[PDB]
Design a protein around this ligand. Structure first.
Ligand SMILES: [Ca+2]
Ligand SMILES: [Ca+2]
Length: 254
DNA sequence: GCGCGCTGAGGAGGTTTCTCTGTAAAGCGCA
DNA sequence: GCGCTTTACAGAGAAACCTCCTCAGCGCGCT
């Protein structure tokens, strides 16, 4: 059906974007937005070119620059956004934000006084299996990696030249989801639950690095923005490292 | 030809969860 | 039985997330 770039998009908003109902006087603002580092300006404009709606804005705070796509137009939200987020639903508890967003929108809530206090539910709404078997998962995951994933290379010591390549990704209150990603990519290193309940999956072995590379070659869509640049950089360094390059067919035209 | 209620655009303020980088210790593989 | 590889674990701090306020101008009711 309707292209898997939309699924990518739901993965990306799930990671870096937000569903918001903010108050303005007696009235409400309905917003689907995404604010990124300036180095992702081209991505914001790709999103805008795909969705065909929303307003680009820039802003400087202290000395850092940011870009935002904001979709506040209720009719554009109803006709374009909900259908997307209905065809390819979000996988984590962020799904609860959307559910309440669409409900308040479609049933005409417009007065700050009609809009109940809300607290994101933490009632699990998925198992590893149900996520893993969803047909759009891999499209969604590329969007999610775009938003939340990190590709880095560093020294195992300081007084040495030995290098580590890692892929890593995290979510607060996202044990199931992060575990699902673990399973799907068949990583084996255990998930780190930190003191803030933030689940952290980090990976380094030749086999795991190979699996992520294979996954991104096989995925129905690519990284579009800055995460592409980083992945390409990572690959650049991967070729100069004995143990990875010699056991992996590193692609040259991702 | 003029209010009336309501709006998306525009401008920004607040806080932490992601990113990004490691380290101390432990596997593991083998003429 | 060392040397190349990986793992558990976790800290820093900004690139995110999520928020509210003001204003020019919309369709609309009554022309
Ligand atoms: Ca996020
Ligand atoms: Ca991001």
């Amino acid at each position: 059906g309707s292209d898997l770039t939309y699924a990518y998009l739901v993965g990306l908003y799930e990671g870096d974007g937000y569903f918001s109902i903010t108050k303005k006087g007696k009235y409400l603002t309905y917003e689907l937005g995404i604010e990124l580092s300036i180095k992702d300006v081209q991505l914001i404009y790709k999103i805008k070119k795909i969705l065909g709606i929303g307003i680009v804005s820039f802003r400087k705070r202290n000395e850092i620059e940011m870009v935002a796509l904001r979709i506040r137009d209720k009719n554009h939200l109803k006709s374009k956004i909900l259908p997307i987020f209905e065809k390819y639903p979000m996988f984590s508890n962020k799904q609860y934000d959307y559910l309440r967003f669409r409900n308040a929108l479609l049933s005409g809530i417009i007065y700050l006084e009609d809009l109940p206090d809300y607290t994101r539910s933490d009632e699990p709404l998925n198992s590893i299996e149900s996520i893993i078997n969803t047909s759009y998962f891999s499209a969604w995951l590329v969007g999610f990696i775009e938003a939340e994933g990190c590709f880095s290379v560093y020294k195992l010591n300081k007084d040495d030249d030995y290098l580590i390549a890692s892929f890593d990704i995290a979510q607060r209150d996202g044990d199931i989801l992060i575990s699902a990603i673990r399973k799907y990519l068949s990583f084996t290193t255990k998930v780190y639950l930190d003191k803030t309940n933030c689940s952290k999956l980090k990976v380094t072995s030749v086999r795991s690095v190979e699996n992520i590379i294979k996954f991104l070659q096989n995925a129905p869509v690519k990284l579009l923005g800055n995460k592409k640049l980083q992945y390409k950089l990572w690959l650049k360094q991967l070729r100069k490292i004995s143990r990875y390059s010699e056991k992996i067919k590193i692609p040259s035209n991702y």
